[PDB]
From TrEMBL, chains A, B, C, D:
Signal peptide: none annotated. Sn-glycerol 3-phosphate 1 binds at G32, S36. GO terms for molecular function: identical protein binding; metal ion binding; voltage-gated sodium channel activity. The chain crosses the membrane at residues 14-33, 45-68, 80-96, 117-145, 191-216. The chain holds residues 1 to 220 of 267 of the full protein. This is Ion transport protein. It comes from Aliarcobacter butzleri (strain RM4018) (Arcobacter butzleri).
Amino acid sequence: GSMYLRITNIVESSFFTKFIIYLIVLNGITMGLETSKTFMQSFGVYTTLFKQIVITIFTIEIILRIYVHRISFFKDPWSLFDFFVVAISLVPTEILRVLRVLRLFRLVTAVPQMRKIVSALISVIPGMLSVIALMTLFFYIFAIMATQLFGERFPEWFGTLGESFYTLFQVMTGESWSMGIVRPLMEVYPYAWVFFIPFIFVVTFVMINLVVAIIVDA
Amino acid sequence: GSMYLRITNIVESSFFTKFIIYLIVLNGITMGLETSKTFMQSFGVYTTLFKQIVITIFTIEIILRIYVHRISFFKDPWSLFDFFVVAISLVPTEILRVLRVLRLFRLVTAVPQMRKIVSALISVIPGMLSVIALMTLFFYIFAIMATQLFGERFPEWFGTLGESFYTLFQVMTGESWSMGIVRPLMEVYPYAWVFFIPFIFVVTFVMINLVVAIIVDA
Amino acid sequence: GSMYLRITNIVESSFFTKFIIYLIVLNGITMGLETSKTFMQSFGVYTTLFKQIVITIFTIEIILRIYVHRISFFKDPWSLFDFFVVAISLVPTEILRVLRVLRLFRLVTAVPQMRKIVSALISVIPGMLSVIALMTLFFYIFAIMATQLFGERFPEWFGTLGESFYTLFQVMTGESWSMGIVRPLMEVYPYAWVFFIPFIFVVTFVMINLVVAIIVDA
Amino acid sequence: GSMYLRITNIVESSFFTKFIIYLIVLNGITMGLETSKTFMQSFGVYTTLFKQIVITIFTIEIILRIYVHRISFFKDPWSLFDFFVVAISLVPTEILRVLRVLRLFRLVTAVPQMRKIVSALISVIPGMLSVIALMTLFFYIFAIMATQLFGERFPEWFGTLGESFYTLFQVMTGESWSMGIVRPLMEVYPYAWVFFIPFIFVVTFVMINLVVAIIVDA
Ligand SMILES: CCCCCCCCCCCCCC(=O)OC[C@H](COP(=O)(O)OCC[N+](C)(C)C)OC(=O)CCCCCCCCCCCCC
Ligand SMILES: CCCCCCCCCCCCCC(=O)OC[C@H](COP(=O)(O)OCC[N+](C)(C)C)OC(=O)CCCCCCCCCCCCC
Ligand SMILES: CCCCCCCCCCCCCC(=O)OC[C@H](COP(=O)(O)OCC[N+](C)(C)C)OC(=O)CCCCCCCCCCCCC
Ligand SMILES: CCCCCCCCCCCCCC(=O)OC[C@H](COP(=O)(O)OCC[N+](C)(C)C)OC(=O)CCCCCCCCCCCCC
Ligand SMILES: CCCCCCCCCCCCCC(=O)OC[C@H](COP(=O)(O)OCC[N+](C)(C)C)OC(=O)CCCCCCCCCCCCC
Ligand SMILES: CCCCCCCCCCCCCC(=O)OC[C@H](COP(=O)(O)OCC[N+](C)(C)C)OC(=O)CCCCCCCCCCCCC
Ligand SMILES: CCCCCCCCCCCCCC(=O)OC[C@H](COP(=O)(O)OCC[N+](C)(C)C)OC(=O)CCCCCCCCCCCCC
Ligand SMILES: CCCCCCCCCCCCCC(=O)OC[C@H](COP(=O)(O)OCC[N+](C)(C)C)OC(=O)CCCCCCCCCCCCC
Ligand SMILES: CCCCCCCCCCCCCC(=O)OC[C@H](COP(=O)(O)OCC[N+](C)(C)C)OC(=O)CCCCCCCCCCCCC
Ligand SMILES: CCCCCCCCCCCCCC(=O)OC[C@H](COP(=O)(O)OCC[N+](C)(C)C)OC(=O)CCCCCCCCCCCCC
Ligand SMILES: CCCCCCCCCCCCO[C@@H]1O[C@H](CO)[C@@H](O[C@H]2O[C@H](CO)[C@@H](O)[C@H](O)[C@H]2O)[C@H](O)[C@H]1O
Ligand SMILES: CCCCCCCCCCCCO[C@@H]1O[C@H](CO)[C@@H](O[C@H]2O[C@H](CO)[C@@H](O)[C@H](O)[C@H]2O)[C@H](O)[C@H]1O
Ligand SMILES: CCCCCCCCCCCCO[C@@H]1O[C@H](CO)[C@@H](O[C@H]2O[C@H](CO)[C@@H](O)[C@H](O)[C@H]2O)[C@H](O)[C@H]1O
Ligand SMILES: CCCCCCCCCCCCO[C@@H]1O[C@H](CO)[C@@H](O[C@H]2O[C@H](CO)[C@@H](O)[C@H](O)[C@H]2O)[C@H](O)[C@H]1O
Ligand SMILES: CCCCCCCCCCCCO[C@@H]1O[C@H](CO)[C@@H](O[C@H]2O[C@H](CO)[C@@H](O)[C@H](O)[C@H]2O)[C@H](O)[C@H]1O
Ligand SMILES: [Ca+2]
Ligand SMILES: [Ca+2]
Ligand SMILES: [Ca+2]
Ligand SMILES: [Ca+2]
Ligand SMILES: [Ca+2]
């Protein structure tokens, strides 16, 4: 209809998208300020009133956007994300506030250069599914072995399957791998390094190949 | 013979290989569950009975695979590995259980994309034999020097040749290289950094070249 | 005029530029010596007198350089920097001395190979503005979440927005990310790793892409 | 002369070079064994007698090699190194033994693949002289500033110019940069991170470019 054309010439207009960008930035600063407990004592009413106005504007904006292109909305991942973050931040007023902080990625969603770069980073991922699965299998296997080997005398670190996964991820990142893990272990299990030095070697060699493999796809 | 043809049309069939894959995954989950001591109190008989059934199936499968292509079996590295892991997990019921956890790499062996990627990672290795030998020689030489220099007043870290190898591998990875090693050393040996700063420099420069050399072979 | 030509055949002469280089090097050594408190007790008058002579020479040199090409001087970034560092080191005799130490980058400014390489390093930067903005937004968002999640029971590290920024930069560099932060946190907040393991993953994946993206522009 | 031809057909023969290689390997194992204090109690006379025989053989070998091609000997870097290490290990029987351990790099010198790879690693270095000089200047400048800023209240780490160089190299490698340095500093100097976060940023950005620049020369 004639009115459908007009609201789409508003929605797909550069200005309306720029306005939702401005609301996003003001809102994000607001969230930066809301951590300041003294600032909150000073301006809780002003900021919270502001929050309510910006969220209502956001909700009606998502509604109009759903109107213009319905099928396109729920098969487009950026609008899918915008829908999902606003819905998350729509519920009546614990961890939900922490997620509400994610509304600021809508600044990625709105800004075309930000879209270009995020889709670039995601387009890198398919190629390394093979190595992510290899590494996941590897971590699972060594985690079970480390749990059954050190989990009893070292419950804090290898006690269960999760704690072992975590200590193996920590060892892979390199963080206190020896003075923190392998050397305290060796006070009781002196050939513990047979388990970790090969583990280090494989992880790094794989992690280095993953980085190499990223490049060649250029 | 006519029967030899039929069992090979089963063995090299997509379905039989997929079945051994399914047994592998169920088994791997089982090994994940067997760490849960309460779950083990609950279902030790069910899981262990399951273990026995899956291992017998695996053994007869390795037998049939050896039948179809004997010479091909012991010159193929993937089947060599499958033979070796099942043989490891075949002995009567300490560290053997920990190895038995390696049966899950048979999931790498069975899955063609997993084969492709592992053979890729191995095909990277020949080219860097030269640098691995250089680095091994380097580590040996500096390990002997560090043992003879700090091994007496620092027995925990450089006392023997092994402890020195380990502290040098730890220093190469970077982990607590200073606050943990070089700075405590300098409380007694104040020009210990003449030994380590050059050591750091050479190791990293070599480690960076090894990464570079990997790429160019593309 | 005839005299303007002569002073420009001095200023743009290889020798005058080499002389200001020599003054820079002598001065830099002087600053190296001035840290030695015993050396300062010995030669405070000689070095400080030297400082005054070299700085006056520098000031009149910047004056003549401004004369030869005025518009060119304040639109050229290297001379802009030379102007700014000498002006910084021109004020009557706390933190100003620490900045005065930056006069030694004038050795970068004077030396053509140094110019070539610094302009190379700067020419790398435009291309990664997109990712620097993405990462800044990311750090802001996770910093607000970490402040509101751990800032109360962990004021030292996530108490305000700044301390959270710092602990997140520290976690990104990898330094004591677990034994130092995430594991002490988990003594009180046991699913704190839901916040950090994804955070680690995104940061590294982005940091690795930033390195990759640098290369391709070759 | 006719005899000069024969000894050169021995010296440049594959067999004579292989023999000095064998002596090198036996000797290197000997040095590995000499760290074992119980093994030394057992076989000090056998090993030391062995040492004397192998070193005399080495000396006469260096003499003959100097004979065949004199000018070529002192302008060739590999033979220069062989001369220098044997001369080092030639003096009458403290730190000299530690250097004597370097005789094992003669295994690099003798082995052609080892020569190829070491000359490759050295051939990488000229191209990065520019950045090594930039980084050295950078380290000098920030070291002077850090000494004058934190050297008094933190003598252990920034007290002199050397301790500052070391703490800056440690911070560059990343090792305990925060929990170990910057955070203890901030207990007294709360805006110390203005000095280190920029320092980190520049170092890494430069260190990443140095790695990139290595590649392109392919
Ligand atoms: C992209 C660049 C981002 C730049 C962000 C830089 C943030 C720096 C934060 C510095 C905070 C430290 C200063 C400070 O002294 O902390 C105190 C304040 C609030 O005081 P507070 O701790 O509430 O005092 C309580 C005292 N009591 C309990 C006894 C009553 O706590 C604060 O000061 C918090 C200050 C809020 C700063 C908000 C900045 C928003 C930047 C927006 C960037 C663009 C967004 C797209
Ligand atoms: C860094 C801050 C994040 C903020 C998020 C903000 C909201 C983002 C949600 C929507 C994301 C949209 C991304 C996207 O559209 O991906 C497209 C990519 C590359 O597209 P493109 O380069 O156009 O090529 C696609 C082929 N074509 C042209 C024929 C269409 O092609 C693909 O999508 C390939 C499929 C890859 C799926 C990978 C899954 C990502 C993993 C999720 C992260 C897990 C964290 C632990
Ligand atoms: C770009 C996409 C990335 C790749 C795809 C997704 C990567 C993650 C897939 C990993 C699948 C396994 C996740 C998992 O095993 O979760 C279990 C544990 C549960 O921990 P929990 O028992 O609650 O730990 C508490 C520790 N304690 C005792 C001290 C209180 O939670 C953990 O401990 C998680 C530890 C890190 C998991 C990462 C393991 C390797 C991931 C795959 C390798 C790719 C490169 C890292
Ligand atoms: C590839 C992705 C892998 C995903 C793996 C994620 C694993 C997460 C493990 C989380 C474990 C922590 C939860 C927990 O509360 O621990 C307790 C349980 C067993 O309790 P338990 O510690 O035995 O209680 C004893 C109490 N007592 C001594 C007083 C009687 O200990 C456990 O909960 C162990 C839980 C077993 C989980 C097994 C998951 C198998 C995933 C299969 C993936 C595909 C394989 C190819
Ligand atoms: C992709 C293939 C990888 C390259 C080929 C294989 C690499 C390994 C070859 C190294 C050859 C030497 C192995 C070796 O020296 O083993 C001896 C020691 C024995 O340790 P031990 O005396 O039992 O240590 C206990 C420590 N303590 C006193 C605190 C209880 O055990 C250790 O300490 C091992 C320490 C790490 C050894 C790595 C040394 C450099 C390896 C070559 C360099 C390539 C990049 C790293
Ligand atoms: C680019 C390569 C740069 C090379 C730089 C190497 C610097 C090495 C610094 C070594 C310092 C440690 C030696 C030492 O024992 O420290 C003491 C001295 C001064 O003694 P001091 O600590 O004042 O004694 C006070 C005793 N008291 C309070 C009881 C009266 O404190 C000092 O020794 C400071 C020594 C000044 C060395 C200046 C070297 C300038 C190199 C110029 C490079 C080219 C510049 C473009
Ligand atoms: C090549 C160009 C580089 C990229 C452009 C510039 C990068 C920096 C842009 C970051 C914008 C935000 C800076 C910022 O948030 O400053 C606020 C805080 C204030 O700290 P403050 O509250 O005074 O901290 C004291 C800590 N305490 C409680 C223990 C005493 O100060 C900090 O904590 C700073 C912490 C590091 C900030 C870096 C954050 C990510 C930067 C963007 C990511 C690019 C790769 C890192
Ligand atoms: C390239 C690959 C290199 C492979 C190197 C692997 C080295 C592993 C070293 C393991 C050392 C730890 C074993 C151990 O229990 O230590 C004790 C022994 C000597 O005993 P010691 O500590 O003297 O006993 C004294 C007892 N006391 C004071 C009360 C009388 O101390 C020793 O055991 C030292 C053992 C010497 C091993 C020498 C191996 C040479 C490998 C040659 C490689 C090729 C060279 C080109
Ligand atoms: C890793 C274990 C080390 C063990 C050492 C054993 C003894 C080694 C001493 C002798 C080294 C000989 C190296 C060498 O010949 O370098 C030649 C390189 C590359 O040669 P090439 O690739 O043939 O190209 C040269 C051009 N051409 C064909 C016309 C001659 O061309 C160049 O030489 C260019 C000049 C570069 C000088 C760089 C100085 C190296 C820094 C020293 C390390 C400092 C440590 C902190
Ligand atoms: C491939 C070739 C590599 C590049 C060319 C050579 C690189 C080294 C050139 C650096 C020139 C300056 C060397 C220097 O400043 O030496 C002075 C100090 C003296 O230390 P000292 O005062 O004896 O320290 C004792 C510490 N204490 C108080 C706790 C007992 O000794 C130190 O602290 C040395 C600390 C590390 C020096 C490295 C500085 C940056 C080097 C250039 C950057 C290239 C990438 C790192
Ligand atoms: C959603 C994002 C997708 C996830 C996949 C992206 C990769 C994530 C990897 C896990 C991150 C931890 O990253 C960890 O960084 C350290 C840095 O010391 C690596 O250690 C590194 O050493 C060498 C030497 O520099 C590198 O060339 C190599 O990349 C890596 O092995 C660990 O091997 C790696 O695991
Ligand atoms: C079976 C696998 C084959 C084994 C060979 C594969 C390589 C294994 C190397 C040993 C693993 C430890 O890896 C260790 O990672 C750290 C990460 O801080 C490296 O430190 C790194 O600093 C720079 C800067 O990022 C990197 O460009 C470089 O790759 C490396 O020198 C150590 O130099 C490296 O030794
Ligand atoms: C003015 C300069 C411009 C600033 C921009 C330049 C980049 C600066 C980045 C911040 C510096 C800290 O750098 C930090 O180094 C560690 C090394 O363990 C990285 O950890 C790394 O793991 C893998 C494995 O090696 C690398 O391939 C990757 O580059 C990186 O993710 C952190 O992810 C990175 O953030
Ligand atoms: C390449 C970039 C280099 C930038 C370098 C910046 C690094 C800064 C190093 C840490 C310096 C802090 O050192 C200095 O500490 C003193 C006291 O100790 C503070 O002094 C302050 O004390 C209190 C606190 O507000 C006030 O009442 C007082 O009036 C004020 O002077 C200074 O404000 C700070 O400058
Ligand atoms: C004789 C040899 C010649 C000497 C020159 C060779 C280079 C030596 C550099 C000094 C070695 C210390 O190496 C130190 O490794 C750490 C690894 O966390 C680097 O940290 C790294 O973070 C990122 C992310 O991975 C890397 O892409 C980058 O290479 C580097 O900045 C430090 O920035 C680097 O300085
Ligand atoms: Ca790391
Ligand atoms: Ca580290
Ligand atoms: Ca490391
Ligand atoms: Ca690091
Ligand atoms: Ca490091």
